[PDB]
RNA sequence: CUAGUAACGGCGAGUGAAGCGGCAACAGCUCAAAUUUGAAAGCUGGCUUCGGCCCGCGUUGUAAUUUGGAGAGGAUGCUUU
RNA sequence: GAACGCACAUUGCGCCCGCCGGUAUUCCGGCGGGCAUGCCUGUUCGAGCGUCAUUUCAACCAUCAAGCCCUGGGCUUGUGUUGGGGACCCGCGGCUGCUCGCGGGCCCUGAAAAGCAGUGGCGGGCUCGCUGGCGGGUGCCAGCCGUAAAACCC
């Protein structure tokens, strides 16, 4: 499921600095001598929290190794409250590679291009059938212990 | 550090950044140029030109063998093509200036001795044949020898061509070289006893003979017109044997035109060695050949 | 391309740098059509084919050929050529 | 030691018979397997039943392959309880479901020559079905002959 | 965004999540040096409202101070000693 | 017998879930 | 350990190859190429892991099993049908004179008594063949290029060529020269 | 100046302010708590032919907008560089 | 001297990069430039039973060819479909018939799903008989065909 989600999110990666300057130079020389809204993976903790609260996010992927874990403990409950499907992924460095940064505490996808909307929908259903109900009973229970 | 960066870009999934980093690396398989800049080391090691010729002996020997050697991971194909082009440009220099003096062939191959600025250079070429590299051999130090001697022979070629006034690098077109022009691919334009041997005669070499060495010898001493078969190469005279213009035809076989004279490459070699025109009757085909000598 | 000898001045060779000696000139024994005095006997050729390589004072024997097409190419060329390369960089030079 | 029957649904096109047997044979030994297929056209109904010899390995396979996103299909791997197993459920197990051209048979039966009296049955069937159709279209009114 | 939630969490310091996290961190800090460089703030909402910026030139430094009196009380605060 | 089948099933489940590489 | 997506991918490739083989077998094997016999180099590339029986039989008849193997093949109707069968695994086209010359001079080996020797001497190739008219290596060079009756024995004599793996260097008529240029 | 006043005190020694009023001088601001999200738009270094090129910091938040006698967003029509 | 290569009460004793003079690539002497600590930014090197990723789930039919006819307009061949359900209208094959097949027209459903599987052969495979050869059974065929027999295989 992480492989499927990262296939979709690799389809919707943002642009690096080189591609952005290259594109801007292209528009500059085109003006010297028409577009739709860009669709990218949304990142940044405060930005993603604002997207979840306004019910704009469609799928939320939360890293599991945020060292100040307070920055993300309320995030599964927040996604549950506002109704956005979420999943916990292994590695903030993995989410970082996707957004061209060293790390990323959380990423979110809000809307996509037409040609893979169905795929996104299936992925959403996948996590809400493959991760959310396997977590549903153990999300409430205390963990750990040395009983035995 | 740049290898670390390109490995980082490959592991990060950035194909475009990987392309940018490998463009910046100048890795010597897509270019053929030596990987590092070796101007200052060869400047400090060789202060003048005759030491460059003295080491160019071994440098040019290495490069001729390497041009007749195949390609592996440690020795790619593009700088082998550069070896071929640079050796052929050097041969064009020799056939323009007639700097070649002595030529002795053998079961090694052929050694050639040429004088440049009063300095003798001896260099050996093997035959056009499959060479086995069996045994324990290291090819990385081979590649180091390669890029070192591309640096030396390129700078020696540029210095010598500026000394003689010929422009460098002389142009060659890819169409006729891809048809097999070999020594006829490179065009040289003058501004940006050897000559009396084969001054005005007509030469043709047949389908059996090694085309490269006898063409090198014939053009080295100013023979005006040398032709060969259509399958041996491209960019020559008429390949028909019925043409009466050709006087001497080099054959070695186990037509018979009366005006045409049938000779063997041993006759060419002894005429080059002795400078006295050893006779074609004594070196006629179909008979046991009298011995020659190594003039060194 | 820019000229390497743009500002050329003579430089005295310091005595510590010992240049590598040049290769010997080709002798009379290494022609493939040698005089009949130079031809070894067939027993000598068999004895040469018998004992081990690199145990020889001389690495070549002359062989008579009638044409250039009859002359083959010896492949250990590369290796012996390879051999002399580490000579000039791993056999030290004594003045 | 009782066998464990496993219901696998939402099959992708490709995960049919030998791929199922191999992939769940990595999970443990399979006694039997059957993919339900259509009568008229040989084609899977995206549904299969696999019988393993060991019930625990069947539970393990069904648990860890249940909501598997395979080729845009989220699988349905559920263990059929031992009390609800139908008796002749693996009737066509370990057999090929051959694709048979029924319509080509019908056409070449239409080509096939009947000899002398089956054409009399032909025209008899033609005439009283024409009579019934004539009653039906005389209910509304449309005359015919011949 | 998230800093509002972290401020509300920091206002419940005996709740289960915050008590658990405070104890685990206290154990680690006790076994470190008295004054040690912190890579990032453990309380980013608190550091951010006090003027910390994720910019070159800003440094966090964690410090432990022995608590208690100096019945002469030290009129200097433990936070000032830190 | 049964223990070997259970161990093989658990190994296959771990290979299916957590993967094979490392 | 092998996962289910590999099984379904394998099955999809095998099915697509099966319909494609049925399509070429049903349709009359006439290429859009003049009836004159030509000469094409064929180099087979990695593609589908599992080979159907008719493609593996044709590849064995064209002796292409090992890594990066190349063989010259005539162009008539039967050979056109054979190479149209095994299109997804092979890449073919018209070679050049320098291509075949350099390719046999760098990598030219011979097969006799079921064993593979390097071309070392012209006496070796003359002992190997003897009497069909070939007398040297340039002879089989222009026998490969210029058409003649001695194709089959010469092609059976030569081992096919184990070209070195490239680092990044359908049907086309001239880009194959750059391919073997980078393949060597 | 208030004022040795209020207040506190072996109510002893005594201790001891401040508001208002008159004057001198006057000046106001920056952040955190917001999603730029139709585009980290921000910054330290190194290389320089000094014009623009690389590495890095940073999304666990660097610019712009805003600071509660406020403000934002739309609309609107004037007025400012 | 905060005093900063070490000591300091000695004009003493070390490390790294260079030079000069006196028998001098080896010996001696002198000289020039550097070598303290805490901390910040960057660079580079290195550790960690801290930690993640590493067995294509992609594209690939013809983006037009070939042949006709009156050389200007078309024609023909290029066989390529997820599975179910419905309170309907038919047609044609079968059956003594109910009914069942094949093909249509009208709807509904997430790439949805909980037995109902039955039509005859040819080859190959497995199995067991007779003295490599001869015969039959098969819920085997990721092999063909449609009952008449092939193709394929070697």
Automatic annotation (TrEMBL), chain A:
Signal peptide: none
GO biological process, one term: ribosome biogenesis
Ranges in a coiled coil: none
Molecular-function GO terms, alphabetical: RNA binding
Entry GO terms, CC: cytosolic large ribosomal subunit
Record's keyword terms, sorted: Ribonucleoprotein, Ribosomal protein
Domain Ribosomal protein eL8/eL30/eS12/Gadd45: 33-120
Function: Component of the ribosome.
Family statement: Belongs to the eukaryotic ribosomal protein eL8 family.
Name of the protein in question: 60S ribosomal protein L8
Classification lineage: Eukaryota, Fungi, Dikarya, Ascomycota, Pezizomycotina
Portion of the full sequence shown: 89 to 242 of 262
From TrEMBL, chain B:
Gene Ontology CC terms, in alphabetical order: nucleoplasm; PeBoW complex; preribosome, large subunit precursor
Domain BRCT: 193-285
Alphabetized UniProt keyword annotations: Coiled coil, Nucleus, Ribosome biogenesis, rRNA processing
GO biological process: maturation of 5.8S rRNA from tricistronic rRNA transcript (SSU-rRNA, 5.8S rRNA, LSU-rRNA); maturation of LSU-rRNA from tricistronic rRNA transcript (SSU-rRNA, 5.8S rRNA, LSU-rRNA)
Subcellular location: Nucleus, Nucleolus; Nucleus, Nucleoplasm
Any one Gene Ontology molecular-function term assigned to this protein's record: ribonucleoprotein complex binding
rRNA processing keyword on record: yes
Residue ranges that the Swiss-Prot or TrEMBL entry lists as coiled coil: none
Family: Belongs to the pescadillo family.
Known function: Component of the NOP7 complex, which is required for maturation of the 25S and 5.8S ribosomal RNAs and formation of the 60S ribosome.
Subunit structure: Component of the NOP7 complex, composed of ERB1, NOP7 and YTM1. Within the NOP7 complex ERB1 appears to interact directly with NOP7 and YTM1. The NOP7 complex also associates with the 66S pre-ribosome.
UniProt-recorded name of the protein: Pescadillo homolog
Gene: NOP7
Parent-protein start and end of this portion: 86 to 489 of 679
Automatic annotation (TrEMBL), chain D:
Name the record gives this protein: Putative RNA-binding protein
Superkingdom of origin: Eukaryota
Record domain RRM: where: 4-82
Location in or out of the cell: Nucleus, Nucleolus
Included stretch of the parent chain: 184 to 329 of 414
Automatic annotation (TrEMBL), chain E:
Top-level taxonomic group: Eukaryota
Recorded family membership: Belongs to the eukaryotic ribosomal protein eL15 family.
Protein name: Ribosomal protein L15
Originating organism: Chaetomium thermophilum (strain DSM 1495 / CBS 144.50 / IMI 039719)
Species classification: Eukaryota, Fungi, Dikarya, Ascomycota, Pezizomycotina
Residues of the full protein shown: 2 to 102 of 203
């Amino acid at each position: 499921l992480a492989a499927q989600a990262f296939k979709l999110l690799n389809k919707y990666r943002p642009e690096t600095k080189q591609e952005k300057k290259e594109r801007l130079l292209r528009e500059a020389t085109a003006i010297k001598e028409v577009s739709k809204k860009p669709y990218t993976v949304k990142y940044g903790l405060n930005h993603v929290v604002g997207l979840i609260e306004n019910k704009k996010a469609s799928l939320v992927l939360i890293a599991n190794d945020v060292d100040p874990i307070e920055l993300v403990v309320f995030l599964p409950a927040l996604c549950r409250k506002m109704g956005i499907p979420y999943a916990i992924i292994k590695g903030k460095a993995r989410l970082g590679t996707l957004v061209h940064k060293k790390t990323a505490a959380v990423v979110a996808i809000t809307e996509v291009r037409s040609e893979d909307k169905n795929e996104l929908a299936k992925l959403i259903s996948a996590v809400k059938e493959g991760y959310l109900e396997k977590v549903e009973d153990t999300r409430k229970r205390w963990g750990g212990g040395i009983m035995g | 550090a740049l290898e670390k960066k390109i490995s980082r870009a490959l592991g990060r999934g950035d194909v475009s950044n990987a392309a940018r980093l490998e463009r910046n690396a100048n890795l010597p398989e897509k270019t053929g140029k030596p990987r590092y800049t070796l101007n200052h080391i060869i400047r400090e090691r060789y202060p003048t030109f005759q030491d460059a010729l003295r080491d160019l002996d071994d440098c040019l020997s290495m490069l001729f063998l390497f041009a007749n050697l195949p390609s592996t991971t440690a020795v790619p194909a593009k700088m082998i093509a550069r070896c071929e082009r640079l050796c052929h440009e050097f041969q064009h220099y020799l056939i323009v200036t007639h700097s070649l003096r002595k030529s002795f062939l053998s079961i090694k191959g052929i050694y050639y001795q040429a004088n440049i600025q009063g300095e003798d250079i001896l260099w050996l070429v093997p035959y056009k044949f499959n060479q086995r590299i069996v045994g324990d051999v290291d090819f990385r130090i081979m590649g180091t020898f390669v890029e070192f001697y591309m640096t030396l022979l390129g700078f020696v070629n540029y210095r010598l061509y500026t000394s003689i006034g010929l422009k460098y690098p002389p142009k060659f077109d890819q169409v006729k070289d891809d048809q097999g022009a070999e020594l006829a691919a490179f065009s040289l334009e003058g501004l940006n006893d050897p000559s009396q041997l084969f001054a005005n005669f007509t030469f043709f070499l047949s389908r059996e003979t090694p085309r490269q060495p006898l063409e090198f010898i014939l053009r080295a001493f100013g023979c005006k017109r040398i032709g060969w078969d259509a399958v041996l190469g491209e960019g020559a005279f008429t390949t028909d044997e019925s043409d009466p213009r050709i006087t001497h035809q080099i054959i070695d076989r186990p037509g018979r035109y009366p005006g045409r004279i049938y000779v063997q490459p041993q006759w060419v070699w002894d005429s080059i060695n002795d400078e006295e025109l050893k006779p074609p009757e004594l070196y006629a085909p179909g008979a046991q050949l009298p011995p020659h000598l190594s003039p060194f | 391309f820019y000229d390497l000898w743009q500002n050329e001045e003579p430089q005295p060779p310091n005595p510590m740098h010992i240049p590598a000696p040049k290769l010997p000139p080709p002798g009379y024994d290494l022609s493939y059509n040698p005089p009949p005095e130079y031809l070894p006997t067939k027993e000598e050729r068999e004895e040469w084919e018998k004992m081990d390589p690199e145990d020889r004072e001389k690495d070549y024997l002359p062989t008579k050929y009638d044409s250039l097409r009859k002359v083959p190419a010896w492949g250990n060329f590369v290796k012996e050529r390879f051999e002399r390369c580490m000579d000039l960089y791993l056999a030290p030079r004594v003045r | 030691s009782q066998p464990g029957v496993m219901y696998i649904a939402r099959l992708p096109h490709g995960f049919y018979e030998h791929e199922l047997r191999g992939y769940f044979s990595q999970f443990g030994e399979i006694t039997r397997l059957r993919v339900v297929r259509n009568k008229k056209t040989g084609a899977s109904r995206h549904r299969a039943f696999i019988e393993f010899a060991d019930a625990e390995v069947a539970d393990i396979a069904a648990r860890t392959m249940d909501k598997y996103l395979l080729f845009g299909h989220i699988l349905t791997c559920k263990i059929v309880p031992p009390a609800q197993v139908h008796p002749d459920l693996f009737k066509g197990a370990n057999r090929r479901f051959k694709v048979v051209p029924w319509n080509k048979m019908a056409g070449r039966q239409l080509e096939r020559p009947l000899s002398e009296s089956q054409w009399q049955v032909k025209v008899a069937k033609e005439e009283q079905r024409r009579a019934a159709r004539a009653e039906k279209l005389k209910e509304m009114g449309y005359e015919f002959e011949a | 965004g998230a800093l509002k939630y972290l401020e509300e969490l920091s206002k419940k310091k005996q709740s289960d999540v915050v008590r658990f996290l405070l104890r685990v961190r206290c154990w680690e800090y006790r076994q470190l040096n008295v004054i040690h460089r912190a890579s990032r703030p453990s309380r980013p909402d608190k550091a951010r409202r006090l003027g910390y910026k994720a910019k070159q030139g800003y440094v966090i430094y964690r410090v432990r101070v022995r608590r208690g009196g100096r019945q002469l009380k030290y009129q200097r605060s433990l936070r000032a000693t830190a | 017998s049964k223990a070997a089948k259970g161990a093989q099933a658990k190994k296959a489940a771990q290979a299916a879930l957590k993967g094979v590489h490392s | 350990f092998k996962r289910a997506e590999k099984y379904v991918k394998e099955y999809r490739e095998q099915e697509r190859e099966k319909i494609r083989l049925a399509r070429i077998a049903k349709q009359q094997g006439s290429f859009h190429i003049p009836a004159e016999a030509k000469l094409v180099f064929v180099i087979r590339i990695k593609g589908i892991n599992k080979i159907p029986p008719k493609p593996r039989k044709i590849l064995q008849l064209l002796r292409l099993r090992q890594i990066n193997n190349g063989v010259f093949v005539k162009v008539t109707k039967a050979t056109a049908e054979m190479i149209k069968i095994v299109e997804p695994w092979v890449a073919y086209g018209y070679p050049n004179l320098k291509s075949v010359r350099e390719l046999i001079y760098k990598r030219g080996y011979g097969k006799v008594n079921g064993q593979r020797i390097p071309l070392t001497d012209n006496a070796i190739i003359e002992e190997n063949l003897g009497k069909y008219g070939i007398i040297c290596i340039e002879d089989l060079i222009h026998e490969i290029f210029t058409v003649g009756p001695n194709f089959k024995q010469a092609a059976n004599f030569l081992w096919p060529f184990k070209l070195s793996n490239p680092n990044g260097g359908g049907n086309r008529e001239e880009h194959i020269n750059a391919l073997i240029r980078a393949m060597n």
